[PDB]
């Protein structure tokens, strides 16, 4: 896409999203601008991707066709705008704040997509739940999906199920770590080196999950 | 590679390997020849990939620089050759037969790589253990790794650990199905549609496993 992408917040999750978009050739680095409250994060974004960085959240929002907000739930009210483009798509992540809440911060009729991504986005295997408001068009939604598809899978869900979404992704790590450790320990006891054992176990788990994902619904 | 690839056996696993190699541009379909005892399998290979098929296992072996054997463990002794190229790499899959055993069937000094792949190769997320004999060169091994890398991960293991390899991949499906079902059921009880619930659960598991695979050894 020829869209300008703006990130308010560029810690681990922002970096993950930018990495996906570049890896999948969805946008070029010269189409991305970011801010963060932490200077080390700006430095990391700049040095890794070569994108435009700024200390002014207004410079990010000024030209952004898609504006991604990845800040503390507690900071939302503060950051949220008269400078945003009239047709900008606002994307809120690490949902803890509803679409209603975000609409009432901008006041006006604004396009909003509330998203709940998860940690494995960091390795290109995220699961992202998206919920658009009524201002978002079919093409607008397609653009946001293309972004989240670049580092994981995506699903459209009602806002009422976002709680259920958090539950799934909050539980998975413990469940997975337990079965990987079990398989890896059994292998180590049978003579396999530990680093090799974890690789076999993790990839075995990943492959079985992919089988379920792709075959037998 | 400019190598001719030969498959004796082209059921699910052969099809998986061919699909990976084509998907990753490792070889073109015009570099692949296959046989199988089952006519429906030959038909499937031909119609899906457009490769050369034959009812003669000798025609497969005649020109193959890499010969992949994916038949019944019970059929190995029968199929195994004076026609094979002098420098051909013999790849045995679904290991139940040792390198020693395969060497003694060919009689001569033959290059052999015993491989143990697993079902999720079918979806591009296999875990393959490889063990070469002393005739295989560094470049020979690299070529075989490139093939198995095209539908999964790979590891070089001693033959004594192949038993451990079978154990890991034989146990994973039950462990994974149990945690995916658990997560999916909890989501369904909380109002999420079942097909959506399985997608979230499976991708959550896949992502956590990828995190272990990539970060923290």
UniProtKB/TrEMBL annotation, chains A, B:
One CC-aspect GO term: cytoplasm
Amino-acid positions noted as binding NADPH in the UniProt annotation, renumbered to this chain: 57
Signal peptide annotation: none
Localisation: Cytoplasm
The keyword Ribonucleoprotein appears for this protein: no
Positions of the Pyrroline-5-carboxylate reductase catalytic N-terminal domain: 4-96
EC number: 1.5.1.2
Chief place where the protein resides: cytoplasm
GO biological process: L-proline biosynthetic process
Residues where NADP(+) binds: 8-13
Listed name of the protein: Pyrroline-5-carboxylate reductase
Natural source organism: Bacillus cereus (strain ATCC 14579 / DSM 31 / CCUG 7414 / JCM 2152 / NBRC 15305 / NCIMB 9373 / NCTC 2599 / NRRL B-3711)
Lineage, highest ranks first: Bacteria, Bacillati, Bacillota, Bacilli, Bacillales
